[PDB]
Amino acid sequence: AISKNLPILKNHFRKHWQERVKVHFDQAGKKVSRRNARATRAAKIAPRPLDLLRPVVRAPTVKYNRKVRAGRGFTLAEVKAAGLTAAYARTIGIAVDHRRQNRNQEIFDANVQRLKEYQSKIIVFPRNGKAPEAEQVLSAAATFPI
Amino acid sequence: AKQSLDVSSDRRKARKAYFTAPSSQRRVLLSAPLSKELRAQYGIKALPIRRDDEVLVVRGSKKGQEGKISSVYRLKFAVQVDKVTKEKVNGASVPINLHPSKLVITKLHLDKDRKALIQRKGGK
Amino acid sequence: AAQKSFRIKQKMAKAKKQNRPLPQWIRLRTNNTIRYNAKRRNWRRTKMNI
Amino acid sequence: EKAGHQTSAESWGTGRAVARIPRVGGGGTGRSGQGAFGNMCRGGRMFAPTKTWRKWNVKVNHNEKRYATASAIAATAVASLVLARGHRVEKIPEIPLVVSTDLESIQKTKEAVAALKAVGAHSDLLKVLKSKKLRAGKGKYRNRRWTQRRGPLVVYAEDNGIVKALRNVPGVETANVASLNLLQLAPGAHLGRFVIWTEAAFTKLD
Amino acid sequence: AGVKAYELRTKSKEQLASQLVDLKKELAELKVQKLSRPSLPKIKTVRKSIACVLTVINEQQREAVRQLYKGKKYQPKDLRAKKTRALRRALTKFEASQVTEKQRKKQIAFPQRKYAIKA
RNA sequence: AAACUUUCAACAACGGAUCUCUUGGUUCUCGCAUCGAUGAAGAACGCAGCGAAAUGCGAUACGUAAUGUGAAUUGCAGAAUUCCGUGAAUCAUCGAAUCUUUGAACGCACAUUGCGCCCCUUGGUAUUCCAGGGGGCAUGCCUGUUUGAGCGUCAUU
RNA sequence: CUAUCUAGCGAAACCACAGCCAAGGGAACGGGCUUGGCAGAAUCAGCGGGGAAAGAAGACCCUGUUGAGCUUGACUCUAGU
RNA sequence: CGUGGAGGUCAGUGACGAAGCCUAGACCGUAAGGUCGGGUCGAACGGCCUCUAGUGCAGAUCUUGGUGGUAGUAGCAAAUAUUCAAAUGAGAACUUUGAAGACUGAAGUGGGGAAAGGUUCCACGUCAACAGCAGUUGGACGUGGGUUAGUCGAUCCUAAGAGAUGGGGAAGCUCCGUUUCAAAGGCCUGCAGGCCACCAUCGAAAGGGAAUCCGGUUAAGAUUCCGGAACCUGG
RNA sequence: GUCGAAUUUGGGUAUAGGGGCGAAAGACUAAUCGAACCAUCUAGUAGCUGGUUCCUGCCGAAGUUUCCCUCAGGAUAGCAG
RNA sequence: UUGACCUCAAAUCAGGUAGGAGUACCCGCUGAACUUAAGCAUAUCAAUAAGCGGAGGAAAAGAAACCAACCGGGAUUGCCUUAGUAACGGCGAGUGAAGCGGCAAAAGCUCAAAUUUGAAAUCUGGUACCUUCGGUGCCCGAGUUGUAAUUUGGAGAGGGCAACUUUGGGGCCGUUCCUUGUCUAUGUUCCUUGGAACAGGACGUCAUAGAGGGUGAGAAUCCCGUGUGGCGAGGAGUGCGGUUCUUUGUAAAGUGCCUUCGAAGAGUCGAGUUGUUUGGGAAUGCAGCUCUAAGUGGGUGGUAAAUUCCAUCUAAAGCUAAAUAUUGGCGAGAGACCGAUAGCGAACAAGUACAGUGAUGGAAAGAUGAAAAGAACUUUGAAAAGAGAGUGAAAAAGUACGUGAAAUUGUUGAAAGGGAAGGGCAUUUGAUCAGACA
C-alpha cells in the first residue's frame, strides 16, 4: 500500500524467493579449504610456484585506459622476441595467448623484459633425476610485480 | 582439552556409544586397577577384567570383602563374585553386581594371551 | 472360503502364528519394555483385509 | 520447513458446530478429526518459524573495535577495576605486572605454575579451582555442563612452549600482543582483567 | 564345539559327502528326540556343522574351476570380480592410457619441467 | 438440631500438570563418491532349543567360511571334548560361499504355487511314455560366425 | 407392552451464574436492576406456559469491487469445419 | 515486575536436603510480583551487571488431554413363554441333565452351499476383561488338535472382452490395432522326400467339460480315510 | 401397486470426472454430484467475523474536509503523542 | 554349371550391452492456476509447481562466427560491484540483465577438407604360447564408398640451402596417502555426613593430559579416555626420492632463411512469416513452414532501409580438470535451538497400530529403585485381595510404580443458610498470628 512521504521502493520478492536463498556460513570453511588446497597443491607441486606468469596489459575502456593489468598471455611475438617458443614456455611456468596482438611497442618491450628477467631468474632441473633438489616459492604473483 | 578434530566431546554420542557398545569394548570399559603389590610387580596399574581372578573391594557397602569372579556380565556392565550374595527373605542366595572400577585385583587368571599382553603394555 | 487360493492360505497360517501373546521369558530379559503384544488381531473386532 | 505441514488437513467448514481451523480427515485413529495447521494447534506450525537467514553476525567498524581494545588495555592498569570483578589482586608487587621474557621458554605447566604462585596469582588460580560449579540451565545437555570464573591473561610476544604449558591450567588465557582478543580482555563486558605482561610484549606495545 | 573346517579342508569330496550324510541322519534323529524331550540344543551344532561342510565342498569345486580357468580370456560371470556394475564396464588402465601419436610427440618434446624462482 | 447445599485445611481418591532427566530431533560446517541383468531397490514366505514383533539371515536360514581380539552368553537349561587353545563370544572385521518364491524380471503365464519345449543323467522292459535330479529356453541393439532369399547383380560355362 | 416402584447396569443434548412475580426505566418484552408483593429443609409422578429453550456462524433480504452452474448476436478467444 | 537461554560476577545456595508442589501462617511492595516459616519431595539452582528471545492468556463455537452437574436419571419394552426338581459349584432367573408346557410349522428359527469371513469348528482348563443384567456358560481367555481325492472342483475350452508381437503415431510415461502391407512354422519318413498355415496369450470354483458308488468310521474329517465293488485316461 | 414380461436377479465384462451413464429427476457415478474421491500448488487470497497474554505513571483523541466503480474501505488535511 | 558382389534376413550362434531404482544438486522438454493488479481479459505469480525423458560425483559450459571502439582486452564457471541500473510494460501493477573493474581457480586442444602411392603402413575377432587390465606369431575378417602417419588455422604443407639442439622403458627399495591395530602420567591416604562419597575438610601427585563419559550423589589423579609421541599390519599407487639394467637409432622432435602455395564444415547461414520467450525495444533466442546463398567471402558492431568506409571474430564438427551446486546417500564434528501436547508425523516393536474398495490417511505411547532386594512366612477370604510380617535410604518407590498440581470427589473438622451464591466500605463476635525489652 501507499503511505506517507517516503522514497519509492522496488523490492523483488513476489516470486517464491524463500526456496532459493544462499547464505555463506561456509565463508570460513571454504577459506580453510582453499588454504589447504593451495598448500597441498604446492606440497605435491615440485616447487613450481603455484601460479604461472601472466603479462602486463593496457587495461581497456576509458574508465580504466589508465590502469595497467595482469592479463592472460604473452604473445608468441614477444616470446620469440625473447628467443624461445610457446610450447617450451608452457612447460615453464609461463602463460601464453594467441589473441591480444601486440600493437604497442613499449608493451612489447616490457613483456619481453619480464620474460628475459624470468628466464635469467629461474633455475630448471635436468631432464634426468638429480638436481640441486629444491627450494620452493609460491609467488610469481609478486616477485615480478606489475 | 582436545586437539584432535576427529574426536567429539558430545554428551549424547558418548553415552550412546557406552550403552550401545559391544562385548568387545565393554571388556575394556570393565577394566580394573591393581593392588599396590601387583602394581609394584608388573609396573602397570590396570587391566581388562576377566573371570576366575581374585579381587578385593575398596568401596560400597560391601567394602573390605574379597573373593573371585563368579562371572562377568558385560550386558549389565557388572561383575559377580562368590562370597558376595544377598539372602532374600525366602533365603535364596543371589549375587550382587559390581562395577569393577571400584575394585582391586589380587590374583590373575593367567594365560598365554594374558602374559603376552602384560609384556605388551610395559608400563611407561 | 472353501475354495481358496494357496497364496491366501499361506497368509492364513501367517496370521494364525502372528495371533498369540508374548512368551513370558522375554519379560524377564535384562532391560525389557515389552509387557504385552501390541499387534494382536481378533477376527471379531478387526480384519486383515485378507 | 515441513513441520506442521506434513498433514493434508483441510477445514470442515462451518455447520458442524466447531471451530474452523483445518482438521485432519480420515478415520480409525486418534488423530482423525484433530486440529491442524496452526501455532495454537498441537502438532502444528509455530508462529513465524525460525529461519536461517536471521542476521547472526554483525559488522562493526574496525576503528571502533580497536578503540574498545585500547580502553580495555588501559583498564588493565587500574587495580580498582580488576579488584572490582573479583580478580585476586590484593597483594600484587606492582601493577601493570611485567615478567621476564624467559617465561616464554617454559615447557612445563608445573614450572610455570610455580612461577605464578611465586609472583602471587595463587588466590586467583584458586578462585578458579574453587569456582567450578554446575550450570543451572538446560546447557548441561547442550555440552556446557560446567561454569567457573575467568582467570588471568598471560601476554607473550613469542611462543616457545608457554601456551601449551598453560592450555590445561583452568581459567588462564594466553594471547599474543598482535591479536589481543577483546573477549578475553573484557569478559562479560566488564572491564579490567588481571593481565600478566611479559617484558618483550610490554616493549612491543609501542 | 563340534567340527572344524581346518580339519575338514584336508579331506576329500567323498569323505565330506559321508560326513554330511551322517550329519543329516543324526539331525533327523535329533528332531525325533526334540518332541520326546522339552528342549534339545545339541541340534544347533550339527546344523552349523552341515553349513561348514557345505561351505568347504563349495570351496573345493569353486577353486577347482578357478584353477581350471586359470588365465583364460572368458571366466564365468559368477567368478569375475563383482566390483560394481559401472566399473565392470568402465575403461581399463590400458584404454585410459591409450594416446594418439601426435600427443605422444608433444608430451615427449615439451613435458612440464621442474623449475624454481630464486636467482 | 440433623441431613443437604456452599466455602476453607488435612488425609485419601480421579488425573498426569509441574520440576529434574534424555541412547531423540533439528540446524550448521567438513570430508567422500559407491545401486542394478555378475539380477538392485522393494515384496511375500519361512528360519532360533524355548519368540509374537523389532532386528538379522535365506533350506548352509538371529546365520557358514577366513581374518583380528582372546574366554564368553545369560531369562532358563544346555553346554565346555579348555580356558597356556587354529580357540568362547548374538564379539569385531569381512575380501570366500549359501543366497526360498518374486520383483526391471528374462520359457509362456500369473486372483493360477498354472502348462510347455531342448541337453545330460537315474529308475521303471522305453529314442518315442512316466517320474526324479542337474542344466537351459525373454526382447531390442552391436561386433562378428555360419546358413540363407532376391532376374538387385557381376563374370564364366 | 410402557411409563410407575425394586435388583443389577447405566449414557446423552444442554450448562456465563442461575432459577417466584408485578410496574418502571432500559438496546423501547428483565431471572438479576429500582420500588413494591413476598419469602421455611429435602422432595415424588406428571406437566408441557416461560426459560425471547436447544438443535444449526440464516438457505429469505442487502452488501462483498467472493464464486459456481446455465444462457445469449454481451467482451475476448478457441478445438473443429 | 516476571519466564527460557548466553557472557561475566557473588572463591553464591545445596543430599545436614536443590528446584518443584500445598499452606484461611507471616513479611515487603500502590501493584506487576519478591521473601520467609511448616508439610511433602528427592538433584540440581539462584542474586547482581549485561545480552538474546519461539518470552507472561480467561476468552478465539481456539488445540490436545482430563473431569463434572445433567443422573444412579433417560432408559435396557418387537419377534406369543416359561415353570418344577436334582447335579455342579463359594455363588445359579439365565450352565447341564431330566420332567412339564410352547413355538418355528417345511416358502421352517431345519438341513446344505456360492460370495465374504478366517480357525470362529473340536477337546481340556478357565471368568480379570466382552457377552450393555448375570455368569459355574460362551463364536470369550489360555493351550493344543483337526481340513487326506486318478474319479469333486481349479487345472482346459472359449463368450462378452482385455492384451503383447510386426508396424504406426507420440517430445514422452505411452496411444492404436490383434485375417497387422511381417520373410510369423511344424506333420510325418544327420538327410534326402513329401503335405498344411491367421499360430500369441489371459478371460466362467453357475456356461462346454473323461471317469465312483456303497456301508462303516472321528471329539472335530470324508464321493478325499477304512472294507468292498467299479470306471476313465495314458503307457 | 405389480406379480410372466419393457420381469427380477447373481457372476463376468465395457464406459471415468467438465468425463461417464441417464424410459430425463439435474437424477446416479462407493452415506459424497448444478461437476466425485486422494494428494499437491496451499498457510491460495479475503476492504469481512472472531481472538490478540504483566503493572504503574504522563498525555489524550476521532466519527469532519477533499479525491477515489468510493459508501462496512483507502489516501490526504485535521484532532493526538 | 561354377564362383563373386550389393541388399535383407535367420540362428537358445561366440561375446557384449540398455532397461529399473534413486532423483538434494544437474541438462532438457512439456507446462498451469490460485495469486497481484484493490475489478479484469495483456501483464505478473512463471519461463515456476505439477507431468516426462537422461547423467555425474559433481554436472553443464568452455578455448571466441567474443567483449569492445580504449592507448584496447582475450576460454569457461562462481563472488563483489555494475544495478534495482539501460530496457521492458494496460509506461499501470510490476519485471529487469550484459560489458568494464577486483577476487577466487586456472590448461589447453583434436577432427574434416591433402597421393602411403617405390608399396593398408590401420583395426576387431579366433587360435597356440607368454612375464595377462596386456603381448608375439598364425589364421579369418573389416576396410580404399578410405583405416594408419601428417596439419587444424595461434597456422600449416611442399621443395631448396644451412647448421644447431633434445630424446625411452623397465625392475629395485624408500617416501606419499588410505585401510588400520597397538604402546604412550598422576591417591582411591586420614576424618565428617550419608545406604552408597563421585560431596565437605586435611594432606598430597601428573599436566603438550583440568575435553567428555561411566562408576550406589558435582571424580584431572577409580576405569575408559584426553594429550604427546612411538612401533607395526594390509592396500592403492605414482606424486617425490634413491638405486639397477638394458637402448631405443638409424628413428623422432624442435630450431633458422629463399621459394610454391596454403584445402578451412550448407536444407546450413541469411531472409520472410507464425508461435513462444526475452530486459532485447521495425523484432534476444528458440522452433514450424516458405525462400535459400557466397569465398578478397561470411557473422556482429543493441533503431528499420539504401550507399561508402572501419573494427573485430571465423560458425554451421568436436574433447577438456579446478574454482561452483547439493534438505539425497555414507562417514565425521559442532550449536546462545526443542526438551516427551515441544523438537522429524515417530526420543519406545512408527510410517507401526488403525481407517478407507482405492489412491491415500495416520496415531497415542518415555522415567520404580543403587540393586528386584519385585514382598518369604502367618492369618481372613473361594479368590482377587486385605491385615500382618519383611526387604529397601525411603513402599509418602510396590510393576496402575520419579515428583504427583488443578478441575473433581469422599471422610473428618469448623462455620452459615426462610426464592441463589459471591463481592466493596465499616465493625462486632469467633479462630489464629507476628512484633518490644534484659
From Swiss-Prot, chain A:
<dbReference type="GO" id="GO:0003735">
    <property type="term" value="F:structural constituent of ribosome"/>
</dbReference>
<protein>
    <recommendedName>
        <fullName>Large ribosomal subunit protein eL13A</fullName>
    </recommendedName>
</protein>
<keyword id="KW-0687">Ribonucleoprotein</keyword>
<feature type="modified residue" description="Phosphothreonine">
    <location>
        <position position="143"/>
    </location>
</feature>
<keyword id="KW-0963">Cytoplasm</keyword>
<dbReference type="GO" id="GO:0005829">
    <property type="term" value="C:cytosol"/>
</dbReference>
<keyword id="KW-0597">Phosphoprotein</keyword>
<dbReference type="GO" id="GO:0002181">
    <property type="term" value="P:cytoplasmic translation"/>
</dbReference>
<dbReference type="GO" id="GO:0022625">
    <property type="term" value="C:cytosolic large ribosomal subunit"/>
</dbReference>
<comment type="similarity">
    <text>Belongs to the eukaryotic ribosomal protein eL13 family.</text>
</comment>
<comment type="function">
    <text>Component of the ribosome, a large ribonucleoprotein complex responsible for the synthesis of proteins in the cell. The small ribosomal subunit (SSU) binds messenger RNAs (mRNAs) and translates the encoded message by selecting cognate aminoacyl-transfer RNA (tRNA) molecules. The large subunit (LSU) contains the ribosomal catalytic site termed the peptidyl transferase center (PTC), which catalyzes the formation of peptide bonds, thereby polymerizing the amino acids delivered by tRNAs into a polypeptide chain.</text>
</comment>
<keyword id="KW-0689">Ribosomal protein</keyword>
From Swiss-Prot, chain C:
<dbReference type="GO" id="GO:0002181">
    <property type="term" value="P:cytoplasmic translation"/>
</dbReference>
<comment type="subunit">
    <text>Component of the large ribosomal subunit (LSU). Mature yeast ribosomes consist of a small (40S) and a large (60S) subunit. The 40S small subunit contains 1 molecule of ribosomal RNA (18S rRNA) and 33 different proteins (encoded by 57 genes). The large 60S subunit contains 3 rRNA molecules (25S, 5.8S and 5S rRNA) and 46 different proteins (encoded by 81 genes). eL39 interacts with YIH1.</text>
</comment>
<dbReference type="GO" id="GO:0022625">
    <property type="term" value="C:cytosolic large ribosomal subunit"/>
</dbReference>
<dbReference type="InterPro" id="IPR020083">
    <property type="entry name" value="Ribosomal_eL39_CS"/>
</dbReference>
<dbReference type="Pfam" id="PF00832">
    <property type="entry name" value="Ribosomal_L39"/>
</dbReference>
<keyword id="KW-0963">Cytoplasm</keyword>
<protein>
    <recommendedName>
        <fullName>Large ribosomal subunit protein eL39</fullName>
    </recommendedName>
</protein>
<keyword id="KW-0687">Ribonucleoprotein</keyword>
<comment type="function">
    <text>Component of the ribosome, a large ribonucleoprotein complex responsible for the synthesis of proteins in the cell. The small ribosomal subunit (SSU) binds messenger RNAs (mRNAs) and translates the encoded message by selecting cognate aminoacyl-transfer RNA (tRNA) molecules. The large subunit (LSU) contains the ribosomal catalytic site termed the peptidyl transferase center (PTC), which catalyzes the formation of peptide bonds, thereby polymerizing the amino acids delivered by tRNAs into a polypeptide chain.</text>
</comment>
<dbReference type="GO" id="GO:0003735">
    <property type="term" value="F:structural constituent of ribosome"/>
</dbReference>
<dbReference type="InterPro" id="IPR023626">
    <property type="entry name" value="Ribosomal_eL39_dom_sf"/>
</dbReference>
<dbReference type="GO" id="GO:0005829">
    <property type="term" value="C:cytosol"/>
</dbReference>
Curated annotation (Swiss-Prot), chain D:
<keyword id="KW-0007">Acetylation</keyword>
<dbReference type="GO" id="GO:0005634">
    <property type="term" value="C:nucleus"/>
</dbReference>
<keyword id="KW-0687">Ribonucleoprotein</keyword>
<dbReference type="GO" id="GO:0002181">
    <property type="term" value="P:cytoplasmic translation"/>
</dbReference>
<keyword id="KW-0963">Cytoplasm</keyword>
<keyword id="KW-0694">RNA-binding</keyword>
<dbReference type="GO" id="GO:0003735">
    <property type="term" value="F:structural constituent of ribosome"/>
</dbReference>
<dbReference type="GO" id="GO:0005829">
    <property type="term" value="C:cytosol"/>
</dbReference>
<protein>
    <recommendedName>
        <fullName>Large ribosomal subunit protein uL4A</fullName>
    </recommendedName>
</protein>
<keyword id="KW-0689">Ribosomal protein</keyword>
<comment type="similarity">
    <text>Belongs to the universal ribosomal protein uL4 family.</text>
</comment>
<dbReference type="GO" id="GO:0022625">
    <property type="term" value="C:cytosolic large ribosomal subunit"/>
</dbReference>
Curated annotation (Swiss-Prot), chain E:
<dbReference type="GO" id="GO:0022625">
    <property type="term" value="C:cytosolic large ribosomal subunit"/>
</dbReference>
<dbReference type="InterPro" id="IPR001854">
    <property type="entry name" value="Ribosomal_uL29"/>
</dbReference>
<feature type="modified residue" description="Phosphoserine">
    <location>
        <position position="49"/>
    </location>
</feature>
<keyword id="KW-0687">Ribonucleoprotein</keyword>
<dbReference type="InterPro" id="IPR036049">
    <property type="entry name" value="Ribosomal_uL29_sf"/>
</dbReference>
<dbReference type="GO" id="GO:0005829">
    <property type="term" value="C:cytosol"/>
</dbReference>
<comment type="similarity">
    <text>Belongs to the universal ribosomal protein uL29 family.</text>
</comment>
<dbReference type="GO" id="GO:0030687">
    <property type="term" value="C:preribosome, large subunit precursor"/>
</dbReference>
<keyword id="KW-0689">Ribosomal protein</keyword>
<comment type="function">
    <text>Component of the ribosome, a large ribonucleoprotein complex responsible for the synthesis of proteins in the cell. The small ribosomal subunit (SSU) binds messenger RNAs (mRNAs) and translates the encoded message by selecting cognate aminoacyl-transfer RNA (tRNA) molecules. The large subunit (LSU) contains the ribosomal catalytic site termed the peptidyl transferase center (PTC), which catalyzes the formation of peptide bonds, thereby polymerizing the amino acids delivered by tRNAs into a polypeptide chain.</text>
</comment>
<dbReference type="GO" id="GO:0003735">
    <property type="term" value="F:structural constituent of ribosome"/>
</dbReference>
<dbReference type="InterPro" id="IPR045059">
    <property type="entry name" value="Ribosomal_uL29_euk"/>
</dbReference>
